[PDB]
Ligand SMILES: Nc1nc2c(ncn2[C@@H]2O[C@H](COP(=O)(O)OP(=O)(O)O[C@H]3O[C@H](CO)[C@@H](O)[C@H](O)[C@@H]3O)[C@@H](O)[C@H]2O)c(=O)[nH]1
């Protein structure tokens with residue numbers, strides 16, 4: 639009996655994403671319902687929140703300086719949340735050598751988290767477009783910012799983020815959901831919002847971890863569009879040490895985000911399938927996997943040996959990488975739900 643539910647749960651667990659992926663690939667066929675406008679030239683405020691990133695901060699403001707967006711339409715706000723290792727002290731060094739780039743560095747009381755810093759920065763922002771970008775993120779081309787901005791021209795588009803590149807099943811979901819209506823996941827490498835909507839929201843909330851995705855999703859719910867077009871590209875920043883902990887800090891942010899998002903309001907009809915499927919994939923399906931694993935483990939230790947064959951196959955499939963990064967993602971999600979439940983105390 640426990641092999642029965644193990645294979646049922648395995649079927650349900652792997653079938654949910656594959657069916658969703660097929661519906662995404664049919665969304666991917668339709669043409670964009672909005673167009674980037676290359677002559678659109680709004681005032682743009684780029685906000686870099688920093689706590690202890692000195693090597694990265696000098697590479698980062700180099701990266702923003704090198705953007706080809708008209709410098710009279712651009713300003714940077716760097717927010718240090720009262721960090722120790724003298725990154726503000728590097729920041730005005732870079733500001734000494736680059737005076738023609740409009741810059742305001744703003745220092746905090748002490749660290750109250752990223753969203754709170756973003757709201758402080760927001761009361762300095764003067765642009766029509768507000769771009770959040772993490773300090774460890776580098777834009778690979780001198781037109782990355784301009785490309786995001788072209789996509790913000792349409793009045794229905796409220797937010798744009800990048801696709802990440804060097805299983806790009808992920809990127810398919812991103813731009814398919816983008817074309818359908820909105821994608822509920824944004825990337826901190828580049829998150830661009832129309833400031834009028836941030837003011838209506840108002841600001842970023844301090845209780846969700848995935849600031850970008852939460853704002854993007856709130857803008858989608860408001861009847862605006864939140865998209866990651868394929869030509870707005872950033873390279874993912876990988877931390878190095880503590881990779882699993884970092885990936886689990888991000889799973890936990892996605893789990894908090896989707897948990898709060900589906901307990902609020904009604905999505906525009908084209909968005910409610912998107913929201914519910916991605917909330918399912920982040921909050922439900924991961925549990926099906928290790929429950930099946932344990933039922934097979936019990937059936938193996940006591941009695942049956944088709945069960946133990948299924949687990950041994952499971953390992954032999956741990957050799958090839960797509961299945962590896964899938965089951966490890968499910969692992970991060972389950973760990974995250976656990977740490978989420980026990981952290982609030
Ligand atoms: N001012 C300020 N800045 C902060 C703080 N914490 C982090 N930052 C800055 O925010 C960026 C990311 O900080 P991380 O600690 O590395 O966060 P993360 O794990 O990399 O995740 C980030 O991106 C995710 C989305 O890709 C988000 O889930 C998350 O909220 C954050 O933006 C960096 O530029 C960092 O200096 C803070 O408390 N105060």
Ligand SMILES: [Mn+2]
Pocket residue numbers: 772774875
């Ligand atoms: Mn980071």
